[PDB]
């Protein structure tokens, strides 16, 4: 289609999809500790503030 | 109080007309060329 | 490339905004509200609710809370409540991904939370749509009018809440669409 090509590898990542399931504990290094400190903010916010 | 929310809707639809106008402005901007 | 950096700049920063719109939305009660022609003053939200007490309208009594389901009205506003916090939790997927920018690809982190803000989108728009439909029970009927019912506003006026989840709506929609076109960009 227009401005893209085949539809799906416009809206996926099908294309080579393995490798990243190596590098899941650097990517859950910094994914927990943003996660948790995300959920701190709006939780603590939310019971603080708008309440 | 009067219980009239017509300024509030008009408020908030202006803030989110200028918001969507920000961020249509930014996707025409990437979409250009 | 300058452009497409300043680009994914603004669009993180306009997604932080999508969240912080939902949030609120979510928490406040501001969704319907109380005209001159209703029986009693007040206003309902997702799941809290505050009513007038007594003939004057002033010193108004408030109840209901997300993590006590007995005090929810109605299964359609606890639904509506579901789907937002569903939302609420995709975009905050969203948020957390941005740290995974630093390592993974940045095609695929871009599709990531293209594919996340448009679930995200859906799950507001089906609570959004799903929300009317509690209009029908006994305290929403008792505070706006017996003309209130299934998809009726009747007395009752709308608030700033509602229309502010239909921009969140829209602004998520354009978000996943930007964040798609980001992700197949710069990677040739
Ligand atoms: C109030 C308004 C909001 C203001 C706050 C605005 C937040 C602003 C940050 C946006 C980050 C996303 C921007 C889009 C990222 C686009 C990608 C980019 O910029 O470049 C990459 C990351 O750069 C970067 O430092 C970006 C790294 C990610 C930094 C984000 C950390 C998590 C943010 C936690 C949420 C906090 C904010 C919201 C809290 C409510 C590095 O390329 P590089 O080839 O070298 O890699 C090697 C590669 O080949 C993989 O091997
Ligand atoms: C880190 C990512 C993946 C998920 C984070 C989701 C967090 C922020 C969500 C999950 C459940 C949520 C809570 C669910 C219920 C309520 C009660 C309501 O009266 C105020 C908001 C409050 C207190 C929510 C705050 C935000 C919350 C804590
Ligand atoms: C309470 C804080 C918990 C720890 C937070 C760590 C956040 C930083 C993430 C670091 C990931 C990269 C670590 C390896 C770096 C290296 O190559 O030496
Ligand atoms: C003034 C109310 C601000 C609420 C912010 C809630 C956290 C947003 C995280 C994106």
């Not at chain 3, 950096?5 to 406040?28: D, H, Y």
């Amino acid at each position: 289609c227009l401005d893209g090509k085949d539809c799906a590898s416009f809206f996926c990542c099908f294309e080579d999809c393995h490798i990243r399931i190596a590098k899941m504990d650097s990517y859950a290094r910094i994914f927990f500790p943003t996660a948790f400190c995300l959920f701190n903010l709006v939780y603590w916010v939310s019971y603080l503030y708008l309440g | 109080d009067s219980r009239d929310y017509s300024t509030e809707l008009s408020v908030t639809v202006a803030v989110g007309a200028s918001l969507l106008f920000l961020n249509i402005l930014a996707f025409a901007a990437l979409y250009y060329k | 490339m300058r452009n497409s950096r300043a680009i994914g700049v603004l669009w993180a920063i306009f997604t932080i905004c999508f969240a912080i719109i939902n949030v609120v939305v979510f928490i406040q009660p501001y969704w319907v509200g109380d005209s001159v022609s209703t029986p009693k003053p007040g206003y309902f939200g997702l799941f809290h609710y505050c009513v007038g007490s007594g003939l004057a309208g002033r010193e108004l009594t408030c109840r209901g809370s997300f993590t006590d389901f007995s005090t929810i009205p109605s299964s359609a506003f606890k639904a509506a409540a579901f789907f937002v916090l569903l939302s609420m939790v995709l975009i905050l997927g969203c948020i957390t991904c941005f740290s995974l920018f630093f390592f993974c690809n940045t095609a695929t982190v871009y599709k990531i939370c293209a594919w996340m803000q448009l679930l995200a989108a859906l799950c507001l728009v089906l609570g959004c749509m799903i929300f009317p439909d509690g209009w029908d029970a006994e305290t929403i009927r008792d505070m706006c009018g017996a003309k209130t019912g299934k998809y009726s506003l009747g007395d009752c006026s709308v608030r700033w809440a509602y229309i502010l989840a239909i921009i969140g709506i829209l602004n998520a929609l354009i978000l996943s669409f930007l964040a798609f076109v980001l992700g197949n960009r710069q990677t040739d």
